[PDB]
Ligand SMILES: Nc1ncnc2c1ncn2[C@@H]1O[C@H](COP(=O)(O)OP(=O)(O)NP(=O)(O)O)[C@@H](O)[C@H]1O
Ligand SMILES: Nc1ncnc2c1ncn2[C@@H]1O[C@H](COP(=O)(O)OP(=O)(O)NP(=O)(O)O)[C@@H](O)[C@H]1O
Ligand SMILES: CC(C)c1ccc(CC(=O)N2CCN(c3cnc(Cl)cn3)CC2)cc1
Ligand SMILES: CC(C)c1ccc(CC(=O)N2CCN(c3cnc(Cl)cn3)CC2)cc1
């Protein structure tokens with residue numbers, strides 16, 4: 082039985098797979114050929130079919146888990162392609178979390194030699210996050226922040242120690258956004274959420290620009306100028322709004338310049354991609370700041386796949402939390418951003 | 434000198450004009466003809482040029498102000514057409530608020546017989562709101578709420594008494610959103626704001642649907658189904674997410690179904706208008722709820738012109754605050770929604 086953990090989200094399926102590297106001579110001999118073919122297929126390919134990807138750079142090597150030494154692998158594919166994954170599975174104890182553990186429960190049970198154990202999406206997140214940080218990223222910090230995020234000639238990624246990680250605000254940016262207040266390893270609550278998340282960025286961007294991938298959307302946004310679409314404080318006041326400490330550059334109305342036909346006619350797709358990214362990211366940052374203030378928590382860690390290969394949004398979040406909180410809040414990030422639920426699921430395996 | 438108050442916003446100019454009705458025989462004789470022509474022009478027309486409108490139904494009749502009896506009139510036009518208004522003014526003490534009091538200060542001074550006194554946008558809002566509610570809407574309540582906002586067979590507009598109006602959370606939905614905590618007549622702060630406001634609704638809707646007016650956008654939204662564009666909790670979980678009290682109908686990802694090309698190809702403009710309205714409105718409601726919780730305030734009044742002739746957003750706000758706060762917060766609304774700044778400006782006239 083291969084050791085998997087699976088997080089089936091609204092958009093992406095994340096899979097953590099533990100590859101034993103201490104396979105003895107007797108164990109190799111007693112290996113069922115199908116179990117051998119799984120391990121060979123998973124470790125000898127980095128693309129699976131047309132849409133599966135192994136994130137090789139995230140691999141944890143020589144991890145000790147459940148008393149065995151092995152490597153922890155991190156794999157993702159679109160939830161839309163889960164029927165393909167299940168069909169190829171019909172050609173094992175599976176701990177599964179995310180909404181799709183419930184939605185596709187019956188489909189997983191079409192695999193006769195499969196027991197499905199559903200685990201809560203956010204309990205797995207907490208356990209996975211705390212575990213990965215505890216074992217480290219192959220000796221490097223799992224957690225990092227952007228030092229001096231207000232000055233760009235100085236803004237740089239630096240490691241951050243989470244050895245006493247409580248209390249902690251966790252902002253899970255997936256399709257939507259869940260915000261968790263973690264007070265201890267067994268004491269956490271979902272403070273709130275927002276539906277303006279990664280799927281809003283991707284959905285709106287596709288409507289506005291015709292982009293066909295998340296990566297293409299980010300590439301368009303990198304070339305854009307969001308102030309072509311956004312109305313700024315200085316467009317309304319002619320400068321700063323000093324009475325309430327609002328700088329001229331702050332966005333007063335997202336997409337607010339698009340009420341004018343002549344501006345809609347001159348804006349570029351790249352501008353609109355960037356305005357979509359900026360709008361969604363700042364709104365998440367502002368919501369996170371308000372929850373942190375209300376929960377009295379000054380460490381805010383952002384996870385979920387909206388931030389993978391998305392340094393723009395990370396820097397936007399780093400700068401915004403630091404600026405608007407006058408340095409009282411810190412935006413934290415984690416290398417294994419999208420995978421903590423899948424890892425937490427895998428960690429539930431002993432209970433079964 | 435006619436008694437005006439003016440709020441020049443990012444999108445709309447609002448004007449309050451006090452028409453004396455106790456003009457004596459000597460006063461009528463000593464009236465300068467240009468002053469007579471202004472009063473006749475303003476009271477004998479309800480449309481001014483191509484874009485000015487007098488909201489006749491909001492008129493306060495037989496008001497006593499500054500020791501005179503008269504009628505208080507409420508007039509609006511697009512800020513884009515302010516050059517026309519100033520040019521026709523060049524063919525008076527003016528208290529002016531809003532960002533445009535600063536941005537267009539020099540333009541107002543091209544009118545030789547004009548002294549411009551700038552007043553703060555939110556100080557005027559507070560004073561205007563408290564004044565109008567104090568004098569009543571011609572004997573009727575200025576403030577109202579939607580009773581039993583969770584049940585649609587019962588949801589109905591009912592008056593609401595603000596005689597002891599403190600503390601109060603004021604949510605000003607204009608181009609952007611300002612959120613104020615009012616603790617007394619002289620003690621209020623801007624808690625925060627958001628750039629996802631009325632200009633975002635109007636800008637995004639115009640990009641997505643080609644609508645050419647605010648009213649057309651609302652009309653499209655009334656015919657749409659936002660769930661064609663939005664991904665719901667039940668689309669991710671297959672039902673409720675009971676563990677965190679999230680009903681299947683709650684939006685999990687706004688525009689989240691638009692990541693799929695086949696759904697983008699089948700969605701209608703009306704669906705996208707409605708999803709834009711729903712997305713912007715719920716996000717404002719959620720932000721307002723978080724501020725009210727943090728400020729420990731249970732009365733939340735929504736103003737600004739995003740809600741004029743917009744009963745959909747009002748009902749959405751009423752239902753959302755009541756549902757998500759488990760009945761601890763009440764959404765309140767005011768008949769003179771967009772005009773409180775203009776009235777507060779007019780009330781500063783004695784100071785000059
Ligand atoms: N290859 C990709 N395909 C799609 N979306 C991607 C991709 N890479 C990054 N993203 C972004 O990541 C988001 C999904 O993040 P993720 O944390 O995996 O959400 P999820 O678990 O599928 N949804 P949820 O049910 O709300 O928890 C998308 O909305 C995109 O903004
Ligand atoms: N006739 C209209 N034209 C334009 N927008 C309208 C109209 N009627 C209602 N609206 C809405 O009302 C919003 C403007 O409200 P308003 O309170 O007047 O803002 P503002 O004062 O001009 N902007 P701000 O500088 O942020 O205070 C627009 O964003 C629209 O959503
Ligand atoms: C677990 C994943 C799939 C998920 C992410 C995000 C959401 C949206 C969400 O958590 N909520 C709750 C709070 N909401 C409010 C609150 N207060 C108001 Cl006044 C209005 N809305 C908005 C909806 C649901 C599910
Ligand atoms: C007065 C009118 C014209 C106006 C309305 C709205 C705005 C936007 C606004 O008030 N803010 C302040 C808070 N912002 C934050 C806060 N915390 C983070 Cl972490 C990120 N952003 C967003 C910008 C400005 C001006």
Ligand SMILES: [Cl-]
Nearest residue numbers: 197198199200
């Ligand atoms: Cl189970």
Ligand SMILES: [Cl-]
Nearest residue numbers: 549550551552
């Ligand atoms: Cl002045």
Ligand SMILES: [Mg+2]
Nearest residue numbers: 090091179255
């Ligand atoms: Mg997820």
Ligand SMILES: [Mg+2]
Nearest residue numbers: 442443531607
């Ligand atoms: Mg305004």
